[PDB]
Amino acid sequence: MCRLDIDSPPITARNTGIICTIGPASRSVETLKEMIKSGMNVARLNFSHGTHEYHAETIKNVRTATESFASDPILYRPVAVALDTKGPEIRTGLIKGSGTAEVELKKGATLKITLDNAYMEKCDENILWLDYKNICKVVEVGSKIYVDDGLISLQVKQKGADFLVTEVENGGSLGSKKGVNLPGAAVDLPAVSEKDIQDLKFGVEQDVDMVFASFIRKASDVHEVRKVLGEKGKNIKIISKIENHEGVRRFDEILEASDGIMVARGDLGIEIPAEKVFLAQKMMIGRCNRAGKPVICATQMLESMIKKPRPTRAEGSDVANAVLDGADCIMLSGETAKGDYPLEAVRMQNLIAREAEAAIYHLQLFEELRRLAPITSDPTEATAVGAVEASFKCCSGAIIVLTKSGRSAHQVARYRPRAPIIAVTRNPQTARQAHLYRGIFPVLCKDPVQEAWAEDVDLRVNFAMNVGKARGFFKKGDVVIVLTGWRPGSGFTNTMRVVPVP
Amino acid sequence: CRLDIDSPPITARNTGIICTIGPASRSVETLKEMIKSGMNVARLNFSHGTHEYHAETIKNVRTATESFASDPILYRPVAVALDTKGPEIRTGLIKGSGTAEVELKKGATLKITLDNAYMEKCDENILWLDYKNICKVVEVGSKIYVDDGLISLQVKQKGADFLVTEVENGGSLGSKKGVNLPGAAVDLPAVSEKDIQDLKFGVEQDVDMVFASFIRKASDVHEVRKVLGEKGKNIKIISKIENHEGVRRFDEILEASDGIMVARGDLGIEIPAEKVFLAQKMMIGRCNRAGKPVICATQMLESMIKKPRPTRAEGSDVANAVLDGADCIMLSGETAKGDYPLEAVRMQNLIAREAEAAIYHLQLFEELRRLAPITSDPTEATAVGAVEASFKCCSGAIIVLTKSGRSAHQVARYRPRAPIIAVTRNPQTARQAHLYRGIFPVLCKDPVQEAWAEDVDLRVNFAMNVGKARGFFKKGDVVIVLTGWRPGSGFTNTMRVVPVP
Amino acid sequence: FLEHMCRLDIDSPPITARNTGIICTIGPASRSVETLKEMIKSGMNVARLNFSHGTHEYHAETIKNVRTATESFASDPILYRPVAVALDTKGPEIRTGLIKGSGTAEVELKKGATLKITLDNAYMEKCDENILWLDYKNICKVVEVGSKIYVDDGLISLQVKQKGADFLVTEVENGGSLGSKKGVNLPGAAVDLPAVSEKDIQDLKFGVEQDVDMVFASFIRKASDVHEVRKVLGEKGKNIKIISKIENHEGVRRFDEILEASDGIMVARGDLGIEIPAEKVFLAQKMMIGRCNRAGKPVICATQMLESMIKKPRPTRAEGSDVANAVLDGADCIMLSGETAKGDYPLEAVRMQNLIAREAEAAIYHLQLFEELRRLAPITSDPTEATAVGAVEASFKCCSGAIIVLTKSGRSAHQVARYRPRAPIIAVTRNPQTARQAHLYRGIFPVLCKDPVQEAWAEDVDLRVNFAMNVGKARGFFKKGDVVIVLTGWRPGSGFTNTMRVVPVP
Amino acid sequence: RLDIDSPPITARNTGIICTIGPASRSVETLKEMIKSGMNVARLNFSHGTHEYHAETIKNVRTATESFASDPILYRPVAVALDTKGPEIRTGLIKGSGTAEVELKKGATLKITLDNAYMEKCDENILWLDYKNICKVVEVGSKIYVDDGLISLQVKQKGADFLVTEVENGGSLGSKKGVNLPGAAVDLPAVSEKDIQDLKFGVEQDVDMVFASFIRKASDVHEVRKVLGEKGKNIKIISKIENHEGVRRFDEILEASDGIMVARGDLGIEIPAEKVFLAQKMMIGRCNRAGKPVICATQMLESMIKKPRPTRAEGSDVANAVLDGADCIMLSGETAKGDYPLEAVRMQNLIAREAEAAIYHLQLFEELRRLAPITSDPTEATAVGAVEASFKCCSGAIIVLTKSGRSAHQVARYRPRAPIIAVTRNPQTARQAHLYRGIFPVLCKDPVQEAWAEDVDLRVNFAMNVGKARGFFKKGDVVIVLTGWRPGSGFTNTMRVVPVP
Ligand SMILES: O=P(O)(O)OC[C@H]1O[C@](O)(COP(=O)(O)O)[C@@H](O)[C@@H]1O
Ligand SMILES: O=C([O-])C(=O)[O-]
Ligand SMILES: O=C([O-])C(=O)[O-]
Ligand SMILES: O=C([O-])C(=O)[O-]
Ligand SMILES: [Mg+2]
């Protein structure tokens, strides 16, 4: 702590993944190009908003912008596509027939909440439609109703037959399709609804890399999501979003069933006391690091940058601390979706994460993740931990890993080497999904499968050498670690070589 | 991994809360509620307001504080802090015509003038500022930042007594906003004529501490120390680190100072914003190791100026600052001018409490005790003995009798979990004790007993009564009591392990 | 640890007084008043009387001589060193008779020669190289032809060639000196001996009458064995410390329950080294010492530590290493048997143990040992325990010359000793038994106050503290300017220590 | 927590060095020595002629090569030469009277340099072979005889004689060693006899030299120069047995291939109570540097006359291994004793127990931490292999090596798993015994045409060896270390492979 040098510059290699929510402000092809250059690694599409056609056009735009860099495979960056589900939630309608329109609420003003489907696209400062039909039976005379991540509070004054009359307890902007939270109250909502099924099936068709599953409360919820994705979506990674008291207390069984976790602080910070979020966050990140599964810190990380070109000091702190905690990915929501400075938001995340990674003392973290990690017979596991240990020993410029499914690179990443992990694959999905794991730099090889297997290995290794040289991870005289197998196919990585850069 | 969420924290909150006073929190009624909510130190910001204004503020603060004096057991001392203006650069007033704030669009040209004719006629074309020698210290290509670093300008043409700039980052420009010049060596005095006037006022008004703005070196601290003079020699100097040079020369500043404030507002503009966390954690750690108060400040709950609930980044920022090892946390605009000042204080009490319960206290003490050098000082030896004993018997408190505070400070250095109840007759000592994590000051107003042994146990029993009333411990519980062998400061040598009467 | 292992310096002299207790067995070689005086000067803390040999008259005269030598230094209480008396029981053992009617006489057994083991009681004081008598009458049922019988801690191995009804004929498989009343071990064989024998009852009764400070209970196999010694000693011997000797497989296997019932432990290697495989003793020793350290109960390392010094004026390199490593393991006391009992160089043996132990103590990284014993120390409600930990931590902080403890029963001083301070613990007591028993605890320097109790209790406390201060200055623990820790209580009685003061030396 | 009811593994890591003498010189006995676990045969050149030692080496090799018919089970046995050095020794006791003379405490004793008394020593008069003794000693100086058991103090100092008083008495025999603590003995570091003996060692193809009384780096360089290019591959193990040797340890270790803690002379030259400090210091520093350290002398001294050791000796052997010693040694136990085989067997049993007591991960954590960041690829591969061996509870680390170097680099990080070192160099196989945990296996199969298959052949050979010795079975996982090309210095490949 005391020997932290501020006048010491960090490397160009950023290890933490940046996830960006794509909406009205960042949807265009030209913006998305600059998003990738700024350091976007994953595009998140929020299915609480917009239509299937809307999201399909966005996915197309993301891919168009991504593939404009495809001509140079050495410098090409894979960008993942993520589907964020609705889940068992209560949401508002469209303001003035638009997904963009907002109305200003005054403190003390009257607001009627209707269940009438005709007002679902005609919401304003006087009337607001909600999609929860059983709402009048779960609220009391004086109950508190929160809207848009708790932004606006509403006290029940009148409880009618098909409506609720409330008073605005605090002012602020109300937009379209905003989340409604009822702390303590019991919601009969299913884990996977009919809309969820259709959205999940749509993701399979659109060829998504991962699903961010909203409001996961238990292990059986994760199994339901996986069953809906079926055999077609068996390789689609499921990231369980923990955003309520139920998901926190049953986190262990959820983590076990999921391919990864997201700390969804927006909803979580109203579902549980705001002063307890940091505890849950640090608990979840630690357990994910221990289990070797991806964890995302999300929501309101640079909230003030929606309206402003520079973050608050608390926001600088937040991003940095999330990385220091051990988060694999950091996330931008409204900051890229609807804000005035989406590029600045991404750029700020690049800079803070890069600084935070230089602050992490890697040896102590590895030594702990080492003795905590159990004894296994798995050859790939032993080769991974042997390579990470060797990387610290010879101050390697990289750890080159050849991988078809990603698994080998994931096993190296869980021991948190300082050296960047260059994951060479021919599988495009594997290259996109690699961004979920801290310190993996995925590179897609499109060279034809070579006649002799030994020469196919050497070519892929040489490809990584060229990538590292061009990006600046290493130069001619440098020492690197190469991980390969003894035969083609997944699950055969058993070889570690200490080689000079050609 | 082992961190528990559904397990609520304990009664006592260790980290001090500093609140900036202004229009939103100036009345006696509001200040009473601030103290109820948890305010320990009231900060007076001398960048704004006359001496009359601040004298009234101190008057109000003391009225609210002394309304609880009827019960010395439950009485909570409130310190008064003076935050100096320092070598500040500010803009002029926006012209009467037009709007309250002028829009500065990206790519546009802006003229910076020093001509007093435009000092109350600022707009999107012409901007006045009060730093006379700006042209001498900036060059073509230099960056100029306005209004908490939200506006950015680059110098295109350097004139004789003017500057032609290009707007880089846009926004709304209001009246009298702060200006920063990173990289440039500003030649404004460390302690100006106004600063001298204000520091003297602080002495006369009997303030407890000074927050000295823009301390760049050790000699800056000495100047402040000299101005406070002999009459104000007991006033603690907290040096604000908020520029590049303050970071480079931190070690000599900390040595000269009584404590440090991580003033992240200006700091986050003078150096890159992505580097502030490094500086914050470096300074807190070094202060903890030195046994000196450290305050984390600025924008901790910004959105709570307008919103009754903080952002998730803000919730994290307050907690991480406590986990880092900060003795105090601060609110500025959240309490000075915001719509929800009491909610801001309450949120800091809540977060701080949770973070303290999260701290692995035994490991922290182990790390600090190992780094603490060997000394023949009896009080130091007694202090470490006390903290060690408090972890062994899960004591409800460490009772410390102190005149100047030093004995209680020495115990606080080793960061025990048990609350340190510092019994004192000195009113200033009880106020200044809030700068130190874990110290709960209690002011004994009882007459001094003729026999010294009976006087001690009177003050010890006073601590037993405070601890029972505030929920620190019960009759069955066991506590640690720190006393001395003779009257006067510098004689604490005795540690006793006694049950609660 | 390896970083600190490399920094060990032989040119760095030990400047601190010796903490580890030295226990000597008293026999023919050290019985006289003249020799016992020199032994106390050389560093003897505890006299051990082995009741497997000699009679009650023999040991009573030995105790008398120990007390005569000890009290010859009593004129000056400042320099006076308390000397404890320890009774070592027979236990469920098998022993030989007297060689040629003498407890000192020896015979040379030669490899290959035949030897007859008889049960006939006419030979019990007439053993030689042809005939040997044992007290275990049920030996013919537990032994078969081909079985091996070990004599005197496995020194002599014998093989059974012919088995009779009341006699065994054996062959000497290896030569060596056979003495009187030596231990007989049959590993694996199921012996049916009681925990407390008829002879043990008489000896323990003798032990109470003679006012001994501690009992070294031989061949303790289980927790009910310790409870049985505790019951036999009764209310009369309730203050007598029971040190259970671990000497066999069952003793090691049931160590936890034994330690819990006992006041302390002795790692009795002589018999243990033959009852279990010799190559496994070091594990037993290290396991038991560590558990005793962590439990805060005294542990003794015993037997063959300087074995060659029985015949030679200097130890082997192995013996030099053995003492050192015993101290580094965490043994409160080290012991001499034959080296002091029958050897030609009893004084040189004690002196050598003083030298090695003092060197090993200087090598102990007290910063690390205290760190571990404190982290693993459980949460307490006892104020005496908390004051003790506070005092030890304060002593490392101000590099004290000593921790001064006023104690009645010793408990307060013992509670300080378990956290292993570097500073010597000057335990001031008016209780003579407390002063003697304190030698079982590492780092405690027991001082007996002879002064009459002052009317004012506060002035009586100050007199005892100043008395400790006089001892510390005289023995060279500290000078005038130095800083010490003083532990006292708030009221008269036992179990009231709660006050720690950091005071300068007058 | 340590448990005696927990059985240790088959693999014993600490090498056993046995001094050969009249009690163990025969081919028949040496065969038993090897089976009981002798790894290195030590030849003490303080005694015997070149003719004598040549026959000893001949016997040791005959006994070693009797197992050569099965390469899978063949155990390499090293030959060590232990120099006389700057020794001081007494003369012969006179023919008349008893074979040994009793020296009594307080009695007067005269020390002479007159060659007429060199075989007429008695209780009144004694001769010794150090001609310049009077020049380096003063009145009051202490002189120790026969392993420090006899102590004399100078009372009168002449030109070529001494009058002493006996402090510690005892029985004095013939040609007994003399020590002069606190004296600057000016005898050559490498004498003319020493040169002859070292040249002889090169001729007889010895594996290592135990150089007596090394005081400084220049002494080591002198020994290195005598061995020359002809014997450059011979390892020099410096014996530390005086005060100057300890004081100048760092330069001695740097110059030498390894260290012996020669406790016999050390415990006389420095106070006996300080020997354990010097031992633990020197072992730690050797562990830190990755160089072999031998603990020697009196480890099981009573086993010269007794079939079972003392309890002090038991712990001594164990604590040597727990300290981190690579090799443990027997002198008189195997050379002249009544129970040489029992002494070897006992060291095998204690060392195996002590190795099971070591917390290997904690030791490896400290060894890796104190090791510098290097560019050396072999160094990095070794550290990765040891790490991987802890993670998958490997049955072994197989290392292909020519000079031993690659296996040595693994051995210094102290893995739990045995290091099977495959080599074709027979000298490498013998010298590998100096390093804790290395099990050298000599492949004698002809070099296969295809190099990739030649590597696989040696790897498969190690698999068969581990299977036969019971280190692992078919289902088990092992670590394999190989290089990218033939020749030394190219080890860079770690494989985790199942047993065939
Ligand atoms: O922390 P400080 O300033 O040294 O005060 C602690 C002092 O308080 C005492 O307990 C009592 O002193 P007073 O009589 O002056 O209040 C002294 O023993 C001790 O020196
Ligand atoms: O859904 C989310 O991302 C949240 O609630 O923070
Ligand atoms: O002045 C301050 O407190 C700042 O700039 O943060
Ligand atoms: O009884 C003993 O002390 C022994 O056997 O070692
Ligand atoms: Mg400022």
Per this entry, what is the length of chain C? 506
Instruction: Give D211's strand partners.
Output: D238
D384, containing H or E segment: helix D377-391
Residue C395: DSSP 8-state: H
Q: Which residues, in sequence order, are bridge partners of residue A242?
A: A263
Token digits of residue D378:
């072999």
Rounded to whole angstroms, the Cα distance separating D406 from D491 reads 7
As given in the structure block, the two tokens for residue D462 are 């190690």
Does some domain include residue A25? yes
D8 in C contact zone (CB under 8 Å):
no
- Alpha helices by DSSP H, C189-310: 198-209, 223-233, 249-253, 255-261, 269-275, 281-295
Q: Distance between CA B250 and CA B239 in Å, rounded? A: 10
* Residue D498 maps to a domain: no
- Name the burial class of residue D500, with classes exposed (0-12), middle (13-18) and buried (19+) by CB atoms within 10 angstroms of its CB: exposed
Task: Name the helix (H) or strand (E) containing A153.
Answer: strand A152-159
Residue A62's SS3 state is helix
Separation between Cα atoms, residue A297 and residue A283, nearest integer Å: 12
CA distance B256 to B243: 17
SS3 call for A461: helix
> Burial code of D32-43, b = ≥16 C-beta within 10 A, e = fewer?
bbbebbbbbbbb
| A349 CA to centre of ligand 2 in angstroms | 18
- Pick from C181, C159, C175: nearest CA to C53: C181
- Assess contact for C402 and C423: CB atoms under 8 A: yes
Q: Go through B396-421 and write b for each residue having 16 or more CB atoms within 10 A of its CB, e for each that does not.
A: bbbbbbbbbbbbbbbbbbbbbbbbbb
Residues A70 and A197 in one domain: yes
| C3 Cβ contact list (under 8 Å, min separation 6) | D366, D370
Q: Reduce the DSSP state of residue D321 to 3 states and report it.
A: helix
- The alpha carbon of C228 and the centre of ligand 1 are apart by a number of angstroms equal to 56
CATH number (domain holding residue D71): 3.20.20.60
Instruction: Kindly state the helix (H) or strand (E) to which residue A267 belongs, with its residue range.
Output: helix A265-271
- B423 domain residue, yes or no: yes
The answer to whether the CB of A89 is under 6 A from ligand 2 is no
* C-beta neighbour count of D453 within 10 angstroms: 11
Rounded distance from Cα B154 to ligand 3 centre (Å): 24
Residue C112 φ/ψ region, left for φ over 0, alpha for ψ in the -120 to 50 degree band, beta for the rest:
left
**d(C-alpha A356, C-alpha A319), whole Å:** 9
Task: Decide if D366 touches A, using CB distance below 8 A.
Answer: no
Q: Do the domain assignments include residue B249?
A: yes
Let me know: does A314 contact B317? Beta carbons within 8 Å.
Answer: yes
**Chains contacting B with at least 3 CB pairs below 8 Å?**
A, C
Q: Domain range spanning residue C104?
A: 92-194
Q: B266: CA distance to ligand 3 center in Å?
A: 6
| Measured distance CA(B4)–CA(B24) in Å, rounded | 37
Best residue among B298, B329, B331 to mutate for probing ligand 3's pocket (most ligand atoms within 8 Å of CB) is: B298
Please provide residue D239's backbone torsions phi and psi, each rounded to the nearest 5 degrees: -85, 125
Residues found in chain B: 501
Has A91 been labeled as part of a binding site? Answer: yes
Q: Are residues D126 and D154 in the same domain?
A: yes
d(CA A217, CA A224): 12
- Distance (angstroms) between ligand 3 centre and the Cα of B213 equals 8
**Residues with Cβ within 8 Å of residue C305, at least 6 apart in sequence:** C319, C322, C323, C326, C334, C335, C336, C339, C353, D311, D312
Question: CA–CA separation, C163 vs C168, rounded Å?
Answer: 5
Q: Which tokens belong to A209?
A: 């890399």
Say whether both B302 and B274 belong to one domain: yes
The phi, psi pair for A240, rounded to 5°, reads: -80, 125
Q: Are B62 and B70 in contact (CB under 8 A)?
A: no
End of a domain among C173, C194, C215? C194
CB B112 within 8 A of CB B162: yes
Chain position carrying tokens 């603490």: B372
Q: Of D379, D391, D484, which has the smallest distance from its Cβ to A393's Cβ?
A: D379
Q: Measure the CA–CA gap between D450 and B35, rounded to whole angstroms.
A: 86
CATH number, domain containing residue D108: 2.40.33.10
Q: Is C296 left (phi over 0), alpha (psi -120 to 50) or beta?
A: left
Name residue, tokens 């009685």: C493
Q: Residue A158: which residues within 8 A CB-CB, separation 6 or more?
A: A164, A165
Same domain, A347 and A361: no
CA–CA distance, C164 with C162 (Å, rounded to integer): 7
Report how many domains make up chain A: 3
Facing residue for C359 by CB, picked from D1, D273, D287: D273
Question: CA-CA distance, C220 to D235, in Å (whole number)?
Answer: 52
Burial B8-25 (b: 16+ CB within 10 A, else e): ebeebbbbbbbbbbbebb
Known binding residue B491? Answer is: yes
Q: Is C500 on the interface with B (CB under 8 A)?
A: yes
Q: A152, A130 in Cβ contact below 8 A?
A: no
Are C308 and C321 in a shared domain? yes
State the best of C10, C253, C329, C364 to mutate against chain D, taking most chain D CBs within 10 Å.
Answer: C10
Distance CA C87, CA C95 (A): 18
CB-based contacts of A447, cutoff 8 Å, min separation 6: A459, A460, A463
Ligand positioned closest to the Cα atom of B264: 3
Whether the CB-CB separation of A216 and A240 falls below 8 Å is answered with: yes
Query: Does residue D66 sit in the same domain as residue D195?
Result: yes
C-beta of A255 in contact with ligand 2 (< 6 A) = no
Which residue among A378, A386, A392 sits closest to D494, beta carbon to beta carbon?
Answer: A386
Nearest to B328 by CA among B313, B349, B314, B312: B349
Ligand 4 pocket member C270 (CB < 6 A): yes
* D500 in a structural domain: no
The structure was resolved to a resolution in Å of 2.5
Residues of A with active-site annotation: 44, 91, 241, 299
- Whether residues B120 and B195 fall in one domain: no
Distance CA B278, CA A461 (A): 37
Domain boundary among B131, B158, B189: B189
Name the pairing type of β-strands D15-19 and D208-211.
unpaired
Does one domain contain both B223 and B177? no
Chain D (145-184) residues lying within 8 Å, Cβ to Cβ, of chain C: 148-149, 151, 168-170
Judgement on whether residues B65 and B45 belong to the same structural domain of the protein: yes
A394, A412, A484: best to mutate for the D interface, most D CBs within 10 A = A394
A362 shares a domain with A351:
no
Q: How far is A169 from chain B (nearest CA, A)?
A: 9
Candidates A170, A283, A310; nearest CB to B1: A283
Domain finish residue from C329, C360, C391: C360
Q: Which string of b and e fits C207-229 if b means at least 16 CB within 10 Å?
A: bbebebbbbbbbbbbbbebbebb
B156 is catalytic: no
How many other CB atoms are there within 10 angstroms of residue C475's CB atom? 17
Quick one: DSSP state of residue C117?
A: E
Query: 10 Å Cβ neighbour count for B56?
Result: 13
Show which of residues 469-498 on chain B sit within 8 Å of chain A, judged by CB atoms: none
Classify burial at B111, counting beta carbons within 10 Å of its beta carbon; exposed 0-12, middle 13-18, buried 19 or more. middle
Judged by a CB distance cut-off of 8 A, whether residue B312 touches chain A is yes
Encoded tokens for A336? 């890229």
In sequence order, the β-bridge partners of residue D82 are D44, D210
D102 and D196 inside one domain: no
- Is the C-alpha dihedral spanning A284, A290, A295, A299 positive or negative? positive
Q: Where are any strands of DSSP class E within D12-157? A: 15-19, 40-44, 78-82, 88-89, 101-103, 108-112, 125-127, 142-145, 150-157
The neighbouring-strand residues paired with C246 are C267
Asked if B285 lies within 8 A of A2 by C-beta distance, the reply is yes
- For residue C68, what are its two tokens? 């005569």
A501/D114 Cα distance (integer angstroms): 74
| DSSP SS3 for D214 | coil
A501 within some domain: no
CB distance C198 to C185 below 8 Å: no
The whole-angstrom separation of Cα C265 and Cα C296 is 11
Q: Is residue A305 part of a domain?
A: yes
Q: Whose CA is nearest to atom 2 of ligand 3?
A: B263
Could you tell me how many helices (H) and strands (E) chain D has, helices first? 16, 22
Q: Beta partners for C49?
A: C87
DSSP letters, C179-190, are -SS-EEE-TT--
CA atoms within 13 A on the CB side of A280: 34
- Residue C410 identity (one-letter amino acid): G
Q: What are phi and psi of B278, to 5 degrees?
A: -60, -50
Going by their DSSP bridges, the two strands B209-212 and A179-181 should be labelled as: unpaired
> A9 with A53, same domain?
no
Residue holding tokens 């008069």? Answer: D125
Rg (CA), chain C: 24
Method: X-ray
Examine residue D458 and state whether it is found in any structural domain, yes or no.
yes
Q: Which amino acid is at B151?
A: I
Residue with tokens 């197309």: A60
CATH number at residue B443: 3.40.1380.20
B96 CB within 6 A, ligand 1: no
Whether ligand 4 lies within 6 angstroms of the CB of C221 is answered as: no
Q: Which atom of ligand 2 is nearest to the CA of A333?
A: 3
Sign of CA dihedral D244, D246, D248, D251: positive
Consult the annotation and say whether B84 binds a ligand: yes
